[PDB]
Amino acid sequence: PTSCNPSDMSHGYVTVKPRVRLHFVELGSGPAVCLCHGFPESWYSWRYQIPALAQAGYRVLAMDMKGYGESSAPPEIEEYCMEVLCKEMVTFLDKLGLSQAVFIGHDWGGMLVWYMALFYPERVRAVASLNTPFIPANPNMSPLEDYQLYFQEPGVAEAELEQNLSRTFKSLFRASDESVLSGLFVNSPEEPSLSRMVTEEEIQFYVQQFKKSGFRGPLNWYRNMERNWKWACKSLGRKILIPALMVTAEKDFVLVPQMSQHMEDWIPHLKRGHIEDCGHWTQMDKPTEVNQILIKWLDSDAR
Amino acid sequence: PTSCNPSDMSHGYVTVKPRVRLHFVELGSGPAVCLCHGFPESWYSWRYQIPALAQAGYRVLAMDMKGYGESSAPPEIEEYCMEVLCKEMVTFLDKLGLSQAVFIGHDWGGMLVWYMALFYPERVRAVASLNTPFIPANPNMSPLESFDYQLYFQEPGVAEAELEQNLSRTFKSLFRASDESVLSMHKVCEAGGLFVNSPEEPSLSRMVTEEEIQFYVQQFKKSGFRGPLNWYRNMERNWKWACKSLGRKILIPALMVTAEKDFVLVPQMSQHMEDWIPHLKRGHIEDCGHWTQMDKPTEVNQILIKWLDSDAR
Ligand SMILES: O=C(NCc1ccc(NS(=O)(=O)C2CC2)cc1C(F)(F)F)c1ccc2c(ccn2Cc2cccc(F)c2)c1
Ligand SMILES: O=C(NCc1ccc(NS(=O)(=O)C2CC2)cc1C(F)(F)F)c1ccc2c(ccn2Cc2cccc(F)c2)c1
């Protein structure tokens, strides 16, 4: 599918709070579709979806999520709890004069669009997650009940991930059958091969983006487990009553399809897609299959 | 009507050419409506329209026109001929992935949206001008032959020196209701200035606040008046380009809004536009001078929304 060249995009900036500006690229007219990337990614992770969604008759806003790229990256952990991130995305809609948008998220972006659908359904026309399930919060078990624990203490994972940005992205952005991960990178190649999914130029784009703020903002997404759980518990097991799509990836070994298995109970209008031979990096692993699932769903449930 | 606070808008940037970025503010969803200000103004000249149009179900893009604000202001006169400006607005639509927009312009922005409708009808859903008529180009007379102040504006550096000398005085002197006007535009050249016979500390017009004036002052500190005055410095090139369009009509929905008390872009200059623009509708605003959007913002909003809702959506 047709990709994006960053020099050639419309770049938008909204100040959602005194020290906090969100960057997005914008393409197309029609219903507003807000794309929300995961860890550790970029608006550019949607490069195969932005043109296809615009061409299908949608107004695509592909965010740099807070902590990333040209969006503000404050260091404080609590700036990256779902409650703060969601309230900022509502403010974003407010300043853009959008009564609602479709929210499509992947990974930590997926977790955010579920929270948006849960707490701000009036602002969410329809919700779609790649890989990330929605599990109702259990008020009995703290988030406690290695790599996510390694990510907890500020400064540690940052030092490993920032040491060599080319190595970081070449090591992470791999098809499931190419994976070099069980530090994160202690027992992994020092000069990893290029994955079949990505080019040198695409890797160099992520390297240039992550030179702006590095990994503190991105890693802070993982450091709010207790805050996110407390906020989720306040949702009093209400249902999500808006059109919803859950897309599972067969070969995502972290966000495994089975973890989505009971979401119909809590999300009555849930549709599903499933992409075979697809690992964690869904948009760039199976961009054609993603585009067909998203557009088929948008055209039927959102337009 | 509700105004805009600049800190609180979505700011967009598109590169239309190597050295040329266009800035806009964006508000609302629905059909794309691109607002094009005149001389010497700002996206902010639409401050009363942006909220009202967004609220009426439109996606408003209020430009900084080339030469202004956060948009690039290259010094070359020919960067500001209608042919270059139009091709840049088409590239702007391209990069935003808009197949078409409604184009609403005032003053020099109005001149641009007529040229857009004329040369890029496929990219223009509908066209509206405040004050600026569409006159077919006469291949017999250069606009040189056809307003001394416009000759004063020709020579690079001259009008710039007067307009940049005191930015607060410039904007307080320009942005006035017709009955408040302190400018004679008649013998500018012989007098040798727009403001030579105008108060040194002009009173604030009833139309604007100190804060609004201070916003235009801040904007015009980035590039000054060269880019804006270059809009005036392409009379021969704009006329030659316009002649190349001779005999082709504008067949898209069109609105002409005249201002009773605009003494330069006088309503009578619009008087024969039906001949060349069969689908033309009209508004007329009484007691309204040149600065239409900020003089009669309520009347402007009603005319534009009534027209958009009937002819454009
Ligand atoms: O670590 C996470 N994702 C990134 C990831 C995923 C897979 C992979 N790779 S892979 O090929 O699958 C495997 C071999 C390495 C790589 C990464 C990364 F390297 F970037 F770390 C992640 C963790 C928790 C998340 C989310 C989103 C939400 N949570 C909360 C939540 C809570 C409850 C249920 C649930 F499913 C998730 C994301
Ligand atoms: O000088 C012009 N506008 C600015 C203006 C207008 C009125 C006023 N003020 S006033 O209140 O009316 C008067 C008492 C002072 C002030 C200004 C300014 F101060 F900024 F210079 C202008 C000139 C030609 C234009 C345009 C747009 C297109 N043309 C080409 C074109 C060619 C052929 C026919 C035609 F109608 C216009 C604009």
HEC string of B231-258? CCCCHHHHHHHHHCCCCCCCCCCEEEEE
Question: Are A29 and B59 a contacting pair, CB within 8 Å?
Answer: yes
Q: Which residue of A has its CA nearest to B17?
A: A8
Say which residues have a Cβ less than 8 Å from residue A178's Cβ, sequence separation at least 6: A193, A195, A196, A197
By Cβ distance, the residue of B27, B51, B97 closest to A96 is B27
- For residue B153 the two structure tokens come to 């504006």
| Residue (of B4, B34, B98) closest to B304 by Cα position | B34
Q: How far apart are CA B296 and CA B293, in angstroms?
A: 6
**Could B95 and A14 be called an inter-chain contact, meaning their C-beta atoms sit closer than 8 Å?**
no
**Could A31 and B29 be called an inter-chain contact, meaning their C-beta atoms sit closer than 8 Å?**
yes
Contacts of B8 in chain A (CB under 8 A): 15, 95
Interaxial angle between packed helices A165-172 and A156-163, expressed in degrees from 0 to 180 and rounded to the nearest 10: 100
Does residue A126 sit in helix, strand or coil?
A: strand
**Could A29 and B59 be called an inter-chain contact, meaning their C-beta atoms sit closer than 8 Å?**
yes
Partners of B12 in the β-ladder = A12, B24
Q: How far apart are CA A57 and CA B38, in angstroms?
A: 32
Question: Are A273 and A248 a contacting pair, CB within 8 Å?
Answer: yes
Q: How far apart are CA A155 and CA A162, in angstroms?
A: 10
Say which residues have a Cβ less than 8 Å from residue B71's Cβ, sequence separation at least 6: B21, B22, B23, B63, B64, B65
Q: A-B interface: how many C-beta pairs under 8 angstroms?
A: 62
Cis peptide before B228 (omega within 30 of 0): no
Contacts of B55 in chain A (CB under 8 A): 97
DSSP for A10-71, written as a single string: EEEEEEEETTEEEEEEEE-SSSEEEEE--TT--GGGGTTHHHHHHHTT-EEEEE--TTSTTS
**CA distance readout (Å), B129 to B34, B37, B125:** 12, 10, 14
Taken in order B182, B187, B192, B197, the sign of the CA dihedral is negative
Q: Which method, experimentally, gave rise to this model?
A: X-ray
Q: What angle do CA A190, A193, A197 make, to 5 degrees?
A: 135
Question: Are A53 and A60 a contacting pair, CB within 8 Å?
Answer: yes
* Mutation site for A-interface testing, chosen from B95, B100, B313 by largest number of A Cβ within 10 Å: B95
By Cβ distance, the residue of B10, B32, B59 closest to A95 is B10
Does residue B23 sit in helix, strand or coil?
A: strand
Say which residues have a Cβ less than 8 Å from residue B240's Cβ, sequence separation at least 6: none
Contacts of B28 in chain A (CB under 8 A): 97-98
Provide the annotated binding site of A for substrate. Answer: 147
* Residue extents of the structural domains in chain B: 1-313
Does residue A20 sit in helix, strand or coil?
A: strand
* Mutation site for A-interface testing, chosen from B22, B29, B61 by largest number of A Cβ within 10 Å: B29
| Residue (of B28, B33, B20) closest to B313 by Cα position | B33
Residue with tokens 């239409």: B292
